[PDB]
Amino acid sequence: MPQWSYMHISGQDASEYLSPGLVQFARATETYFSLNNKFRNPTVA
Amino acid sequence: GYNVAQCNMTKDWFLVQMLANYNIGYQGFYIPESYKDRMYSFFRNFQPMS
């Protein structure tokens, strides 16, 4: 769907819509600042 | 308005203690995990009164 892809419900995984630099950063800064809870995880049956 | 959680202990000190014992501070207060919270640990023996 168009509006599901726009609102990040479907088409891709949570890791795949974020920028590589930001993820590189989220993993580096984890032990003293968590950024997992900032982005939805969609799971598709 | 510097005391906290129904006693005469301060917001500052409570925050220092959560950060030092469990590293909670800047991501917001919540109940610390059981495995972290043992006999000589702060939160376990914390008993506030009125």
Side-chain angles (χ1 to χ4, degrees):
Chain A
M1 279 183 79
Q3 300 193 60
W4 290 10
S5 179
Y6 173 111
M7 286 296 300
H8 296 101
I9 299 157
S10 201
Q12 69 300 112
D13 288 302
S15 65
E16 292 200 304
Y17 64 72
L18 294 164
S19 180
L22 192 54
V23 175
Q24 162 176 242
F25 198 97
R27 281 191 293 169
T29 54
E30 183 67 27
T31 50
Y32 44 72
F33 213 83
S34 194
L35 268 157
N36 283 320
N37 54 83
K38 302 328 177 185
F39 302 116
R40 285 329 79 191
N41 280 228
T43 43
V44 175
Chain B
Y2 292 155
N3 302 334
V4 65
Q6 284 285 105
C7 65
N8 58 351
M9 191 278 290
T10 66
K11 286 174 175 97
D12 292 346
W13 186 252
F14 185 67
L15 179 67
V16 167
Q17 292 308 310
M18 299 293 260
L19 263 179
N21 285 255
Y22 306 119
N23 310 281
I24 304 177
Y26 299 114
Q27 301 166 90
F29 309 122
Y30 58 89
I31 288 162
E33 299 96 312
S34 52
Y35 54 93
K36 286 184 164 281
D37 196 30
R38 281 187 176 186
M39 179 161 296
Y40 293 82
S41 331
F42 154 61
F43 191 84
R44 177 63 56 161
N45 299 297
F46 180 51
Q47 293 301 328
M49 318 180 182
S50 278

